[PDB]
């Protein structure tokens, strides 16, 4: 039971199986931009604003219009990446709390679940006080001091113990099967086919099909937690690392023409925020301009 | 014309704006020497109408009218006098530690009796102590008063930034963190619409008195059903509870705050920039 | 609590003149639902609709289905009224737990100067959803429901424990109680263990007129004497108005006189509770309008058959019959009717009303199956399903398999309970036809079943293994020499996805408003049956059948 | 290592806030989404409960003759005692790979609609894919928990 | 502001000129907002609506219809009024003439009928061109809503006869509503049509609701919640009124719109909405009868 | 104005850009106060709730909790809207478009009603941005209060059938002539039910203790009927007042409370407020500067503040 | 009947019998009848020649 | 609409009830919505009316 599994771990005993950890560090780097001589356009306009008088004069801004095209048919003027300043969010031990958000039917034995309510959320750094109202965020508390940096989120996915350690000695997909929209061959149906149809083998590790069938298949325990369609979290503003991996629409939503693929990597928008104590999932009004090869 | 001044000469028997802050949500005392008469009228006869004949008469004992009429009621004077009434104790009562150390509970104790006596004979405290403004200047004498505390639209909370270059003036406190009722936790961007609601409980809590400000991006037609919902003080039957008028628009939800520093540590909310639409009252149900 | 209270607002109806009534609070607990056939999980998932109708015992019609209220709360349902729960203060009254169930008060048919009629049944119905599978029916006679008197003597020990527990709560908690609560505690200590609510059932004490118990004590404590020579309840309001902060008319009758009487159920050996407050306009209340009940029929027909030792009152003596008829005139029904459609003087008279309909349809089935299958038949086919080449050898079994089925279909039609038969398609297709000789119950009939005769309605039985029913829902498939099938328009059951007779291991069985049914086998091999030539339902017998099984559509 | 010359530790008491939520017992959409496109008769030896009938004295010779037919038909769902680990992970040799979904549950081809404490011979025909519940940790198959 | 001109017509006398000197600062109603207007749009003779003189209903229809204008400076050959209803909120300070109550520092005063006070007071007549300027009375919102419901209540006891409603204290003063000697006999014939309007909208609806709600709830969320907040109120009113009174759906629901159509008339008729505000500066906060007051534009 | 803009979000059907030009002076219900907002919450697809579209009584309840806005100027990039609820401070009297079959008056209060007319649907369709647009119909307010009583009572006849099928349609309207027929297609129940309850619950409080003395004078009403003109015309033929004619109940406690005066107060509190609690609040008033006494169908009338 | 100043019949059975006997279809005939406040609402016909 | 009279003769609704009414015998024959006549060459003169 979830009640029994609360009651085995604090004692300390291996409960038949294992896990896997997916988390997100963040690194501020000093990039280098080479350019060709004649690449951009960047024209100029005219400067005047007499706006709304706000008291003692409007005080007279003067804005100017411009605009610029890519005057060049190829990959002009590109980019580099060389230094590691400081690891902004820490390498951290901070776990995940699923009681942060409402997502599930509770126990019907209501005496049990309210015991387990505060049993989990006794004193987590990601544990709220005065828990969930009807609409709104959980309001993760603020500790009195922070030292090393922004905090990590260590989300866990159940794994059987009997896989190889050879897988995970590689940059591999943590769900246990290749999932991204790169490998598909433009036959209009292969995208979801490598995703869920485990009749075939892995594109990544083709002597097998998956590595965690609890994390791979449709309606599996991996798929039940972090699917964007199910949206268990969504009230809790804690950013899932695993939200990026487990979304049936979003990887399928991408194109595959390579010209637009690499340039989005130069300026993508993350789901994280460098203006918050935890990985608060990105506020809908702000930009981030991340690199993000994952 | 987006700048105005108003002036009323009263006593410092009431508010004492020298003991107040630069920002206070002043009420007048319209019909001040009134209510021996309306104590007798407008009520069913099972209310024993000889109560308010003495009740306000004990108020001006603590405060002869003369030529300086009793008026310019502070925002503090209702919160602490109802602090023992409504559902907040030892936090609303910190407003009493604000008054009696700066203003006086002698005038509160006569008026907290009025807050059980006015509401007793159906003489409800709405449409008495009408809205006046945000305490611009305090050109008052020693024991007398002469205040300019402008009414008349958005200009009261515009004319706050222009006079002082450093920081901000008035900046419109809420004077209690229990006050400024955080309605609409269902949060979104827009502008704030401020109102002045007196929530009652008639013969359940023995003629309850309440003063607090709501927070909503809601119209007056989307406020009356919002006045029927979210309440637990329906358990009455007399009637005509929960009057309200418009305190006006705060045309920004971004500038609200959370503080406990004023002038005794009293929790307080900064609210910068307000269209003070003076509005109108309504009390039927 | 309030479901007992809001039904009294429906008892506040009054207005237009009609036969005068009462209201009895009846608390069914858990196992009286569980042994009935009520899934306790599905009602645990508080205001809930109950469709009720009332039925006479001897003859006559029934009530239409009345929408009522419910409060199904898993708790100590006796202890929750007695020890209620303030949200801030749930330990205001610690108690002993108990079983729980639905809170439903039920109205009572009476007379002018009301003499209630025992053996006459009010019928409950819980509707989980629309369907007849989401329905059960409950039986209650007034002998089961009506005690002669209540037991407000158990209310005497309860009320002073309330004052001691206001003397117990403030002394434990201390200065954390507000200014209105620190007063009303010690005003209950100058006026003089857990509260077990089950002891109020099991301590032998009840109501008494006590006028005979004053003269029996005045001539007892004068012997004695000759040899020799604001209340506490008003402080209970501030006890609630400070700890809760409001009035709560739900809790207002938890301070007043409460009788909690135990009774029993004649259907499944169960127990239940009969409740009356003081301020209830319902039965047993001390604010109630006359006329009230009279336990006279429950003493007349008993003692005229008990002193005469008449075991069954059709063996009652002819002068002993009519002298009771000279006393109580509504008994001409159950004593002087030639063939009443309801059986006179039996417990299962409503149950034996049902089992005939279970019988009479099976003969209408069983002599109609022989009718279309008199001799060697020619059935050739009626649907369009094409074969693969080795698929015909499957029907080589269906030649050999065939005749054992038609026994075991009818065996299973015998094998069902009739209470479980009324959820099937044939038991409602007849009601779609007996309403045509009116909308039948649970509205399983679609909007377009009453349009043509081509709208049939199927059941599905398992062909191989055991011959078992494979549906909850009547699956109404519109059928067009040949004619291809078509569904209608539209929590997950396996077999409900196919056309009738489309595949192996399925027997398909449809019926009509015309009540010309089909028996569809896999492979198109089907045939009509004129069951309309064999339904022999007498209309005065059937008019008590339909009214208990129809619903007046708005 | 942290963001220093600093050590860190991740226990399995670390896993308290994730495995203990009441969503481990939330398999409503799972049984529904697998239910369509049905499975055929999987000769349900271990996928069906019989109610008892008669004395226990002859109960074998009931079940000996009752499952004389759909026992030599095919195989039971478990064959994985012969299967080594990662032979389950590979696409061949495990048609039941798409049936292992939850750590706390089982999806197996059982009987369709007959209520379980009843009958002897279930009607072999269409099949159903429902649940049971995994009770203790040892019920995980031996290619996932090594011996 | 946008000052509008009303044209003085031809030859008037010096007392007719002095009648124009006793009105500097009154309230004037006008139909349209043309920048040049005449006196023919102003007079009480310009209030004829059905061929007869209007009553206090017939005025309060127009008093809620046409537009207020306040004369700042009086002129020969012109009338300058800076009108209230034009301009942004709380701008364009204007000056009024008080009548017998106070008009305190706030109150939001309301224009209303003359015959609720002395009828031939403020009915100032021009003698030469023979017209009548019946100026409305600027009463503040509490007392203006007070006195309007009292005389129509006094019209009931004057309707079908067999306490005294007329004392009505202010905050300090005792306000003599009764101007007995010749006015009150003209009162109950000049509010004559109006009392019938306050009555017929009550007799229709109450005798409609007592055959509506018994025809409702059985013809269910509104059913049980009908008397939920009306427990021992509506059923008690069903106990009190339906007993000592008398007791049809297709004319009934036809009468449902018609009464509520008349109800929407009366809300526009009654209740005297505020139009202009007193919120002055550097005054004594208390205005007296015959003295000016700085009055600002919008409520 | 306290300027508020709504941009043209994505693409343009080239005649439909001209369709936004001839909507100058109409009304947009935007449920906010924004400096910029998308066009997605503007259209009737936002008026449609979860799964179901509102009825013409539900659209009243849908126009309850949103904010009307005046089209001021139409750009190919944005549309500048002025927030009626606040920014009506216009001595320039920002202008509106009358889209209504009634030639109004000068001086009418104007309240907004959903399109319910038989021939003035105001349906303009955008297919590049897949949206449907229902503009409200500005009308005079007594004519507006004559409509909302019909449509609820038509939905009152949606609860009970009983009567024969020939019902009075509640679908012929009267303004000086001008027979108007409206649409009766669908009546959603909850929009009827919540509107019916406030019609019940307000009429509860509008009866008081001193109200009961007035009920005695019901036979006094018909005594004026056969002896004047005004009363007999006031007394309607299709009224229950002529039907109910075919007493102090003493209970006198104290008798110094003014019981008759207190009756007309609380009656006016709730029965006096029946047009505005059911329908939208009027804040638009007819005010033409040129002395024009009426405003034609399709014209641009100048608009002033709250009546 | 466009006007209303005349005191009507006292018997109601003659009152709204003779009222609608004339008004029934007149070119000047007050339909949706005479409000206490408002206008008589003369029936404008569709076309006039 | 015969509730409104003839614009040509305001003192009468029509001058013919048999043809001028909707679904009357004139409109049954000669309106083209039914086209009782017409697969035929001969011009009906009344088609325009």
Short mmCIF file of N, CA and C in Angstrom, two decimals, chain C residues 248-339:
data_model
loop_
_atom_site.label_atom_id
_atom_site.label_comp_id
_atom_site.label_asym_id
_atom_site.label_seq_id
_atom_site.Cartn_x
_atom_site.Cartn_y
_atom_site.Cartn_z
N UNK C 248 -27.16 27.38 13.58
CA UNK C 248 -27.25 26.01 13.06
C UNK C 248 -28.54 25.33 13.51
N UNK C 249 -29.66 25.57 12.82
CA UNK C 249 -30.90 24.83 13.13
C UNK C 249 -30.80 23.31 12.95
N UNK C 250 -29.74 22.80 12.33
CA UNK C 250 -29.44 21.38 12.40
C UNK C 250 -29.15 20.94 13.83
N UNK C 251 -28.39 21.74 14.56
CA UNK C 251 -28.02 21.38 15.92
C UNK C 251 -29.05 21.85 16.94
N UNK C 252 -30.08 22.58 16.52
CA UNK C 252 -31.03 23.14 17.47
C UNK C 252 -31.92 22.05 18.05
N UNK C 253 -32.18 20.98 17.30
CA UNK C 253 -32.97 19.91 17.87
C UNK C 253 -32.11 18.82 18.49
N UNK C 254 -30.78 18.99 18.46
CA UNK C 254 -29.91 18.12 19.25
C UNK C 254 -29.85 18.55 20.71
N UNK C 255 -30.43 19.70 21.04
CA UNK C 255 -30.58 20.17 22.41
C UNK C 255 -31.93 19.82 23.01
N UNK C 256 -32.94 19.58 22.18
CA UNK C 256 -34.31 19.36 22.62
C UNK C 256 -34.55 17.85 22.77
N UNK C 257 -35.82 17.47 22.96
CA UNK C 257 -36.14 16.09 23.30
C UNK C 257 -35.97 15.17 22.09
N UNK C 258 -35.15 14.13 22.27
CA UNK C 258 -34.82 13.19 21.21
C UNK C 258 -35.12 11.78 21.71
N UNK C 259 -35.99 11.08 21.02
CA UNK C 259 -36.24 9.67 21.28
C UNK C 259 -35.61 8.85 20.16
N UNK C 260 -34.91 7.79 20.53
CA UNK C 260 -34.20 6.93 19.58
C UNK C 260 -34.68 5.50 19.84
N UNK C 261 -35.59 5.01 19.01
CA UNK C 261 -36.28 3.73 19.22
C UNK C 261 -35.72 2.72 18.22
N UNK C 262 -35.46 1.49 18.68
CA UNK C 262 -35.03 0.42 17.79
C UNK C 262 -36.23 -0.43 17.39
N UNK C 263 -36.29 -0.78 16.10
CA UNK C 263 -37.29 -1.71 15.57
C UNK C 263 -36.58 -2.69 14.64
N UNK C 264 -37.36 -3.49 13.92
CA UNK C 264 -36.78 -4.51 13.06
C UNK C 264 -37.54 -4.65 11.76
N UNK C 265 -36.88 -5.27 10.79
CA UNK C 265 -37.35 -5.37 9.41
C UNK C 265 -37.81 -6.79 9.09
N UNK C 266 -39.05 -6.91 8.59
CA UNK C 266 -39.65 -8.23 8.39
C UNK C 266 -39.18 -8.92 7.12
N UNK C 267 -38.28 -8.29 6.35
CA UNK C 267 -37.87 -8.89 5.10
C UNK C 267 -36.58 -9.68 5.21
N UNK C 268 -35.58 -9.12 5.89
CA UNK C 268 -34.26 -9.73 5.95
C UNK C 268 -33.69 -9.78 7.37
N UNK C 269 -34.54 -9.89 8.39
CA UNK C 269 -34.19 -10.05 9.81
C UNK C 269 -33.40 -8.87 10.37
N UNK C 270 -33.44 -7.72 9.70
CA UNK C 270 -32.54 -6.63 10.02
C UNK C 270 -33.11 -5.74 11.13
N UNK C 271 -32.27 -4.82 11.59
CA UNK C 271 -32.68 -3.77 12.52
C UNK C 271 -32.71 -2.42 11.81
N UNK C 272 -33.49 -1.49 12.37
CA UNK C 272 -33.43 -0.08 12.00
C UNK C 272 -33.99 0.75 13.14
N UNK C 273 -34.03 2.07 12.92
CA UNK C 273 -34.25 3.05 13.97
C UNK C 273 -35.50 3.86 13.63
N UNK C 274 -36.34 4.10 14.63
CA UNK C 274 -37.48 5.01 14.52
C UNK C 274 -37.19 6.23 15.40
N UNK C 275 -37.22 7.42 14.80
CA UNK C 275 -36.77 8.66 15.44
C UNK C 275 -37.93 9.65 15.47
N UNK C 276 -38.07 10.37 16.59
CA UNK C 276 -38.94 11.53 16.69
C UNK C 276 -38.30 12.56 17.60
N UNK C 277 -38.26 13.81 17.15
CA UNK C 277 -37.79 14.91 17.96
C UNK C 277 -38.96 15.47 18.77
N UNK C 278 -38.72 16.57 19.48
CA UNK C 278 -39.81 17.29 20.13
C UNK C 278 -40.51 18.26 19.20
N UNK C 279 -39.74 19.08 18.49
CA UNK C 279 -40.28 20.19 17.71
C UNK C 279 -40.64 19.74 16.29
N UNK C 280 -40.68 18.44 16.03
CA UNK C 280 -41.00 17.92 14.71
C UNK C 280 -42.50 17.93 14.50
N UNK C 281 -42.92 18.37 13.31
CA UNK C 281 -44.32 18.27 12.90
C UNK C 281 -44.60 16.84 12.45
N UNK C 282 -43.55 16.05 12.27
CA UNK C 282 -43.60 14.62 11.99
C UNK C 282 -44.18 13.85 13.19
N UNK C 283 -44.35 12.54 13.01
CA UNK C 283 -44.93 11.69 14.04
C UNK C 283 -44.02 11.58 15.25
N UNK C 284 -44.63 11.58 16.44
CA UNK C 284 -43.91 11.54 17.69
C UNK C 284 -43.38 12.88 18.14
N UNK C 285 -43.53 13.92 17.33
CA UNK C 285 -43.17 15.25 17.77
C UNK C 285 -44.16 15.78 18.78
N UNK C 286 -43.67 16.69 19.62
CA UNK C 286 -44.52 17.35 20.60
C UNK C 286 -45.01 18.70 20.10
N UNK C 287 -44.85 18.97 18.80
CA UNK C 287 -45.54 20.03 18.08
C UNK C 287 -46.12 19.39 16.82
N UNK C 288 -47.31 18.82 16.94
CA UNK C 288 -47.92 18.10 15.83
C UNK C 288 -49.42 18.35 15.77
N UNK C 289 -49.93 18.44 14.53
CA UNK C 289 -51.33 18.70 14.20
C UNK C 289 -52.13 17.41 14.24
N UNK C 290 -53.28 17.40 14.92
CA UNK C 290 -54.20 16.28 14.78
C UNK C 290 -54.85 16.31 13.41
N UNK C 291 -55.29 15.14 12.89
CA UNK C 291 -55.33 13.78 13.44
C UNK C 291 -54.00 13.02 13.43
N UNK C 292 -53.82 12.15 14.41
CA UNK C 292 -52.65 11.30 14.51
C UNK C 292 -53.06 9.83 14.35
N UNK C 293 -52.09 8.93 14.54
CA UNK C 293 -52.28 7.51 14.26
C UNK C 293 -53.14 6.84 15.32
N UNK C 294 -53.76 5.72 14.96
CA UNK C 294 -54.49 4.88 15.90
C UNK C 294 -54.14 3.42 15.69
N UNK C 295 -53.63 2.78 16.74
CA UNK C 295 -53.26 1.36 16.69
C UNK C 295 -54.48 0.48 16.99
N UNK C 296 -55.48 0.59 16.11
CA UNK C 296 -56.75 -0.09 16.32
C UNK C 296 -56.91 -1.30 15.39
N UNK C 297 -56.53 -1.15 14.12
CA UNK C 297 -56.52 -2.29 13.20
C UNK C 297 -55.48 -3.32 13.62
N UNK C 298 -54.39 -2.86 14.24
CA UNK C 298 -53.37 -3.75 14.78
C UNK C 298 -53.79 -4.40 16.09
N UNK C 299 -55.01 -4.14 16.56
CA UNK C 299 -55.50 -4.78 17.76
C UNK C 299 -56.84 -5.48 17.49
N UNK C 300 -57.58 -5.01 16.48
CA UNK C 300 -58.87 -5.60 16.17
C UNK C 300 -58.72 -6.96 15.49
N UNK C 301 -58.11 -7.00 14.30
CA UNK C 301 -57.97 -8.24 13.54
C UNK C 301 -57.03 -9.23 14.21
N UNK C 302 -56.13 -8.77 15.07
CA UNK C 302 -55.32 -9.68 15.87
C UNK C 302 -56.14 -10.36 16.96
N UNK C 303 -56.74 -9.58 17.87
CA UNK C 303 -57.40 -10.15 19.04
C UNK C 303 -58.70 -10.86 18.69
N UNK C 304 -59.37 -10.46 17.61
CA UNK C 304 -60.52 -11.23 17.16
C UNK C 304 -60.09 -12.55 16.54
N UNK C 305 -58.83 -12.64 16.13
CA UNK C 305 -58.26 -13.90 15.67
C UNK C 305 -57.36 -14.55 16.72
N UNK C 306 -56.99 -13.82 17.78
CA UNK C 306 -56.17 -14.42 18.84
C UNK C 306 -57.01 -14.99 19.97
N UNK C 307 -58.07 -14.29 20.38
CA UNK C 307 -58.97 -14.85 21.37
C UNK C 307 -59.82 -15.98 20.80
N UNK C 308 -60.12 -15.93 19.50
CA UNK C 308 -60.81 -17.01 18.82
C UNK C 308 -59.86 -18.07 18.31
N UNK C 309 -58.54 -17.83 18.43
CA UNK C 309 -57.47 -18.71 17.93
C UNK C 309 -57.60 -19.00 16.44
N UNK C 310 -58.10 -18.02 15.69
CA UNK C 310 -58.22 -18.11 14.24
C UNK C 310 -56.85 -17.80 13.65
N UNK C 311 -56.20 -18.82 13.10
CA UNK C 311 -54.82 -18.65 12.67
C UNK C 311 -54.74 -17.81 11.39
N UNK C 312 -55.74 -17.89 10.52
CA UNK C 312 -55.80 -17.12 9.28
C UNK C 312 -57.22 -16.57 9.14
N UNK C 313 -57.39 -15.25 9.01
CA UNK C 313 -58.74 -14.67 9.09
C UNK C 313 -59.62 -14.88 7.86
N UNK C 314 -59.26 -15.77 6.94
CA UNK C 314 -60.28 -16.35 6.06
C UNK C 314 -60.96 -17.54 6.72
N UNK C 315 -60.34 -18.11 7.75
CA UNK C 315 -61.00 -19.07 8.63
C UNK C 315 -61.71 -18.39 9.79
N UNK C 316 -61.94 -17.08 9.69
CA UNK C 316 -62.67 -16.35 10.70
C UNK C 316 -64.16 -16.67 10.61
N UNK C 317 -64.81 -16.69 11.76
CA UNK C 317 -66.22 -17.04 11.85
C UNK C 317 -67.08 -15.97 11.18
N UNK C 318 -68.22 -16.35 10.57
CA UNK C 318 -69.01 -15.38 9.79
C UNK C 318 -69.59 -14.24 10.61
N UNK C 319 -70.01 -14.48 11.85
CA UNK C 319 -70.34 -13.37 12.73
C UNK C 319 -69.08 -12.64 13.18
N UNK C 320 -67.97 -13.36 13.37
CA UNK C 320 -66.72 -12.72 13.75
C UNK C 320 -66.10 -11.96 12.59
N UNK C 321 -66.49 -12.27 11.35
CA UNK C 321 -66.10 -11.43 10.23
C UNK C 321 -66.86 -10.11 10.24
N UNK C 322 -68.20 -10.18 10.22
CA UNK C 322 -69.01 -9.00 9.98
C UNK C 322 -69.08 -8.07 11.19
N UNK C 323 -68.88 -8.58 12.41
CA UNK C 323 -68.83 -7.70 13.57
C UNK C 323 -67.60 -6.81 13.54
N UNK C 324 -66.48 -7.33 13.03
CA UNK C 324 -65.33 -6.49 12.74
C UNK C 324 -65.63 -5.53 11.60
N UNK C 325 -66.45 -5.96 10.63
CA UNK C 325 -66.86 -5.08 9.54
C UNK C 325 -67.83 -4.01 10.02
N UNK C 326 -68.57 -4.29 11.10
CA UNK C 326 -69.41 -3.26 11.71
C UNK C 326 -68.56 -2.27 12.50
N UNK C 327 -67.35 -2.67 12.89
CA UNK C 327 -66.47 -1.77 13.61
C UNK C 327 -65.62 -0.95 12.65
N UNK C 328 -64.83 -1.62 11.81
CA UNK C 328 -63.89 -0.96 10.90
C UNK C 328 -64.26 -1.27 9.46
N UNK C 329 -64.73 -0.29 8.69
CA UNK C 329 -65.37 -0.58 7.40
C UNK C 329 -64.43 -0.69 6.21
N UNK C 330 -63.13 -0.45 6.37
CA UNK C 330 -62.22 -0.55 5.23
C UNK C 330 -61.74 -1.97 4.97
N UNK C 331 -62.22 -2.94 5.75
CA UNK C 331 -61.79 -4.33 5.65
C UNK C 331 -62.71 -5.18 4.77
N UNK C 332 -63.59 -4.55 3.99
CA UNK C 332 -64.43 -5.28 3.05
C UNK C 332 -63.61 -5.77 1.87
N UNK C 333 -62.56 -5.03 1.53
CA UNK C 333 -61.55 -5.45 0.58
C UNK C 333 -60.90 -6.79 0.87
N UNK C 334 -60.12 -6.91 1.95
CA UNK C 334 -59.38 -8.16 2.20
C UNK C 334 -60.22 -9.29 2.77
N UNK C 335 -61.55 -9.14 2.85
CA UNK C 335 -62.41 -10.21 3.33
C UNK C 335 -63.52 -10.59 2.36
N UNK C 336 -63.95 -9.69 1.48
CA UNK C 336 -65.12 -9.94 0.64
C UNK C 336 -64.86 -9.54 -0.81
N UNK C 337 -63.71 -9.94 -1.35
CA UNK C 337 -63.48 -9.74 -2.77
C UNK C 337 -63.22 -11.10 -3.41
N UNK C 338 -63.85 -11.39 -4.58
CA UNK C 338 -63.74 -12.73 -5.19
C UNK C 338 -62.33 -13.14 -5.60
N UNK C 339 -61.67 -12.33 -6.43
CA UNK C 339 -60.26 -12.53 -6.77
C UNK C 339 -59.57 -11.18 -6.71
#
